[PDB]
Structures are given as C-alpha cells and as structure tokens.
Amino acid sequence: SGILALGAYVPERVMTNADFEAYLDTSDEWIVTRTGIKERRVAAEDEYTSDLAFKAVEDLLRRHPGALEGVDAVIVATNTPDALFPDTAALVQARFGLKAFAYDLLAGCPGWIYALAQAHALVEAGLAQKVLAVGAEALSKIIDWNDRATAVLFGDGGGAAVVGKVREGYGFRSFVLGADGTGAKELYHACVAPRLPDGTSMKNRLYMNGREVFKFAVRVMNTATLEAIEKAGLTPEDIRLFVPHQANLRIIDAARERLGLPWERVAVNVDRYGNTSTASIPLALKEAVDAGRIREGDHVLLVSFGAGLTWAAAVLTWGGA
Amino acid sequence: SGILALGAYVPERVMTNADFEAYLDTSDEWIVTRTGIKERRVAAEDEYTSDLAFKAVEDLLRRHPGALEGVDAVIVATNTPDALFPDTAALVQARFGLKAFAYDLLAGCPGWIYALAQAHALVEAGLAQKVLAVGAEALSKIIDWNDRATAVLFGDGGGAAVVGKVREGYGFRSFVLGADGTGAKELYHACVAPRLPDGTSMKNRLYMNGREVFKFAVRVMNTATLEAIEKAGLTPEDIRLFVPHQANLRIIDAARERLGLPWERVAVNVDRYGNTSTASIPLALKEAVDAGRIREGDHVLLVSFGAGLTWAAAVLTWGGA
C-alpha cells in the first residue's frame, strides 16, 4: 500500500517566543537555541482536536478531490481526543459521511506512523480498501501554560493521508515500530490513574524528563532509521528526504549528523509550528510535497519517538497513486 | 489468524443491587427487570485498567504458559486508560518484558472486536507474528455513583487473547466493523472538549440516552450478526455459540429471539459482571470455554455495539493452535 492523498492544517493564531517573554522567565534566545522553535500555532478557544482533524481532511480534499471515495476506515492518531468516547475517528467519519469503521489510536508522538502501519495492514489484509489516517493534537488544551519547560515546546495541528493500493514499485517498503513502558515516568499526563506501574505518581499536568527523552530520541531515531532503510532494501544514499518528528532541532540536528546527512535531505518546520506531536510528520510531508522536495518515485523516510516510551520509522516510495 | 490463547479477570469486590439500595432511590426489582444485572465487580482503590489488563494476561499465561512467545505487538482496547500517555498497552508491554510495539485502541464497547480485527491484519500483513489483544475497563473510576440511571449498569474487568497463525480451517472467517459518529450525543464522556461537533454540550461525567442506545443495539446486533455469518460463508445454523456484548439482558434476549435462538446457544454473564465494555466478550468467552460450551472447530460469533456509535461483529472458528 501507499499514500494516495495528503493534507494538513495548523490553527490560525500564532504565538511568538516574544509572546512567551511577555509573562514567563524565558527569552527568545533560550528558546531558539535550546529547541530551535521561533513560533507555534494555537487552536482557537472553541477549536478542538476533532476540528483540527476535520480541517486537515478538508485540506486533503481541496488538494485531492474525491479522495475519500473508497475509504472504509478512519484512524485518528491522537493523545488529546475530545472525549474518552465517542472517539474522534467516529466524529471524522460522520463529518465526511463515510461508510467506515473508526477508532482513535493512542501511542504518543509516534501515533501517526503507527496508524500508517495499521492502515497498511488493513489494506493488505483486505479489511479496508483505503484508510484515512489522521494525526491530530490540541496540546494547548492539556499544557500548563506556566510551566517553562513545556509551554514553549508544543504547537497544535492536524494532518491526514489516505492509505491505499498503489502502482507496482511504489508505496510502503518497511516499518520499524517499538515501545518500552519502563520509561513511562519520563513523559506522561494521567487520565484515569494517579500513578504508574513502577510507582511514579502523576499530577494533573503534562510532565517531561527532557534530559532522558533527549538521550532516547537521538539513539532511537538513529537505530530505527537505519533498521527501516535496511529492512526496506536500500541504503541512506537511496533516501531522497528524511522526515523526522519535529520535537527539537538539536535532536534532529544530532540525529542527522549521526547519519552523514546534509540539511537539504532533512525536513524541518519545528521552527514555525513547534512540536505538533502526531501531526508533525504529515505537516512536514505536505510542505516537502509542495516544494517539490518529495516527488513521485522518491524514497522517503519517516521516523518518530515519544511517550510510552514509543518509537517508529517507515520507508515509503512516494506516489504510485 | 486465530486465537492462540485466552485469559480474563474481574476484581474481587462485589456490588449487589442491595448495595445500591443502601444509598440510592432504586430497588433490586427495578434493576433486575430493566437490565438483568444482579451483581458487578468493582476494582480496588489501587487497581486501574492497566492492573486489570495485567491480571487478564496473567490468567492467560496460567492457562497457556509460554503464549507471549512470539508476541510482536500489544493492543489495549479501552475507554478508561490510566493516562493519555504513556498508553496502557506500553505498560502491559513492559510488565511482561515483551519486545513489541504497543498502543491503546479507543472505539467504545466494540473496541475489543476492533482490536481482534487490527490484530488479524497485523498478522496476515506480516507486521506481527503474534499480537496480544486486550480488552480492559475500569469504569468504576469514571462513574457517577449518585446517578441511579448509570451507576448500576457497569462493571470493571479485563480480558485478553493472543492472535496468531492457526492451522488451516481455523481462525477468523469474517469481520464486520462500523461507526456512526452522528450518534455522538447518544453516549459520551468528555476528555479535552466541553462540546461535541454537533454542538451537544457534554456534562462533566458520563451521559447516556438509554432509549436510543437500546433501539440501535437490537437493530445493529442482528444486522451485523447476520452480515458476519454470511460474510464467513455460513448460516446461523452453523454457529455453536453467540457471544454478544454484555450490556443488558433485555437487549440480549431481544436480539436472541430475533435470530430464533434458544438460550443454550447464547453466552450470558451480564447478571454477575454488569456491563464491562471491552472486557465483556473475552470474559464471556473464557467462561464458555471452561464450561465446555465452545471447543476446537466450533464456529463462534462475536458481536458488540456501543459508544461512537460503534458496532462490530466477527465469526471465528475456535482453536487451531
């Protein structure tokens, strides 16, 4: 299978590092050099994850008319769903009046790649002809605006792609997916439980152990990437563009170097949207497609890390639609 | 693919209809006549969904030692996860030292059947050799005890199965999955948003339009069931046991007659465990297997309906390990 259509969306309201210097013990430099982020988008007051998801699919439809035709499944990779139930995928299914099964997938930042793999399996096993895989997050709704550490890191967003059968030679070539819950204390936000299996208590706000998360991303992003490229039957030199989770520029930087890569073969936008979690990669792919950095026939590598701990990577030969 | 192993668990504490009379404007008679529920189990104060899942997996290991061997993925179908992240499936993955990817699946009551189908897909598509598919729910943590119309309908519990390759002639023969998000206002529980897309304001706790969820239930149950049976290339007469979601004995009895089935062919445990959502079917299945009601080669029908609105059904030829 492969990606037949793509679209993405970011809320209209922008928030500059300046906006953060206006009320928090932090500078634009602290931010620009520690994370690489300059601005990020924030969802309107009454704009939630489902809305970001709806808007991302509308964009998909503007760019690819009639693309939802044949779609039998909607998977929304998110970690900030509107409700425990109904799931956000069911809301998306309704909005576009699809005859399809639907569910939300929670697996941290790597949720979208996880959804692509799941979509692939569904299409390949014949349970669905096409699958609408959405990556959508409204982190501004669970973020502690006062917490210096978090506040400047996350941005809101939505992305989507339709996965389906593609021409001989194109599509997904490999997937590397993994998890390690012993590192559950390193990144989290409770919901129904007040503590984790190891005993690490949870508070009513987003918590992150950046130092370890950094150590993780760097090593994981690298192993996974090579494993995927390798599992795909290629080599780094065969990859037209690497598209990593947009969490931190240093991390992306650090991971590129570790791979002998020029910034031209790496997608970046964390500077303009911050960490949009699951929407990160689809937001980036969209810009690359539109700039022509990604074209039918290219080998693209996707890789992500996040809460769980979870990590994933994929190699997709673009196009074949 | 087929089911290689099965396990389930319900917390120790019992809550009788009398325990509800001891503090609520209700009677045992109203409860039993309206739903069939006589008892339900409640998780301990220090026992959450993850814990119910561990216990279910522990039961499965006790029945099938060495069943996690070859498990490449963990999927936890639930609507009451310990946290938005880490996902519960990762906690399960770590607890049993599995080398696998993991994620929580949110699709209301049908979540477990949804998980079986995704699992079947991962196996057939070659992304996983075996998958641990869990259905666990700690509804007691989000229930409004002072609400006579909901507080008596649910129970806590967990269930689990390992999905993998089974000998020819066994395994899943069909899956029927669906969603209608326009039924969002009919059953919900907010998480990040205070309103549903159609504008339905959400109260702080769980709301449920009982009349609608009933009509819909008996309706979809039969249609989905008949479709699944036909899709599997069989007729109702070929089914050894019908295992419907355990929400209401009336709905169950209603659906039962609609298909012209004697009770001996329906698995029922709603009267002792109440509605346990995603854990409902694995629990009923475990008991059926132990009571000798289901054996290798029998064709079993699974069907569920719930929040979304969501609905699922599957036909599985038991055994084949």
Check if A299 is active-site: no
User: Cβ neighbours of residue A126 under 8 Å, at least 6 residues apart?
Assistant: none
Minimal C-alpha gap between A183 and chain B (Å): 9
The number of beta carbons lying within 10 Å of the beta carbon of residue A52 is: 30
* Packed helices B88-95 and B49-63: angle between N→C axes, nearest 10 degrees: 40
- What is the CATH number assigned to the segment(s) A1-170? 3.40.47.10
Active site residue A64: no
How far apart CA B120 and CA B169 sit, in angstroms, is: 15
Helix (H, G, I), strand (E, B) or coil at A233: coil
CA gap B136, B129 in Å, rounded = 23
| Fold agreement between A1-170 and A171-321 | yes
- Where along chain B do its domains lie? 1-170, 171-321
B243 strand-pairing partners: B302
Rg (CA), chain A: 18
Within 10 angstroms of residue B269's Cβ, the number of other Cβ atoms is 21
Tell me whether residues B179 and A89 touch, CB distance under 8 A: yes
Q: Does A31 touch chain B (CB under 8 A)?
A: no
Deposited resolution, Å: 2.3
Nearest CA in chain B to A92: B181
Contact between chains at A310 and B87 (C-beta distance less than 8 A) = yes
**Which residues of chain B does A245 touch, with a Cβ-Cβ cutoff of 8 Å?**
none
Strands A130-137, A71-77: pairing kind: parallel
Query: CA–CA separation, B305 vs B177, rounded Å?
Result: 10
Q: Which of A17, A109, A248, A269 is catalytic?
A: A109
Contact A110, A311 (CB under 8 A): yes
Residue A146 appears among annotated catalytic residues? no
Q: Are β-strands A101-106 and B101-106 bridged in parallel, bridged antiparallel, or unpaired?
A: antiparallel
Residues whose CB falls within 8 Å of the CB of residue B123, separated by 6 or more in sequence, listed in order: B1, B129, B130, B131, B163, B164, B165
Test the A interface: residue of B54, B84, B185, B202 with most A CBs within 10 Å:
B84
Segments of chain B assigned E as strands: 2-9, 13-16, 39-42, 71-77, 83-85, 101-106, 130-137, 157-164, 171-179, 187-190, 207-208, 239-244, 299-306, 310-317
CB < 8 Å from A in window 126-155 of B = 127, 138, 141-142
Q: What is the DSSP string of B166-217?
A: --TT-EEEEEEEEE-GGGGGGEEEESS-SB-TT--BPPSS-EE-HHHHHHHH
DSSP alpha helices (H): ranges in B208-312? 210-231, 249-258, 270-273, 280-290
The single residue of A189, A245, A248, A299 carrying the catalytic annotation is A245
A82 closest CB neighbour out of B95, B121, B191: B191
Q: Please choose, from the candidates A180, A310, A314, the residue with its C-alpha nearest in 3D space to the C-alpha of residue A247.
A: A310
Q: Is the peptide bond before B86 cis (omega within 30 degrees of 0)?
A: yes
Q: Measure CA B304 to chain center.
A: 7
Question: Tell me, what amino acid is at B195?
Answer: R
Nearest to B94 among A51, A73, A181 (CB): A181
Write down the experimental method used for this entry.
X-ray
CA nearest neighbour of B15 among B25, B7, B23: B23
Would you call A214 an interface residue with chain B, using a CB distance cutoff of 8 Å?
Answer: no
Instruction: Please return the burial class of A97, using the count of CB atoms within 10 Å of its CB with bins 0-12, 13-18 and 19+.
Output: exposed
Q: Which residue has the tokens 């899956």?
A: B175
Domain B171-321 class, CATH top level: alpha beta
Judging by beta carbons within 10 Å of its beta carbon (0-12, 13-18, 19+), is residue A147 exposed, middle or buried? middle
Q: Give chain B's largest Cα–Cα span.
A: 55
Residues whose CB falls within 8 Å of the CB of residue B162, separated by 6 or more in sequence, listed in order = B3, B4, B5, B6, B60, B64, B67, B68, B71, B130, B131, B132, B133
- B158, B116, B155, B105: which is closest to B136 by C-alpha? B158
- Give the C-alpha separation, A75 to A91, whole Å: 11
Alpha-carbon distance B29 to nearest alpha carbon in chain A (angstroms): 30
Return the closest-CA partner of residue A265 out of A273, A278, A274, A256.
A256
Q: Tokens representing A153?
A: 């890191």
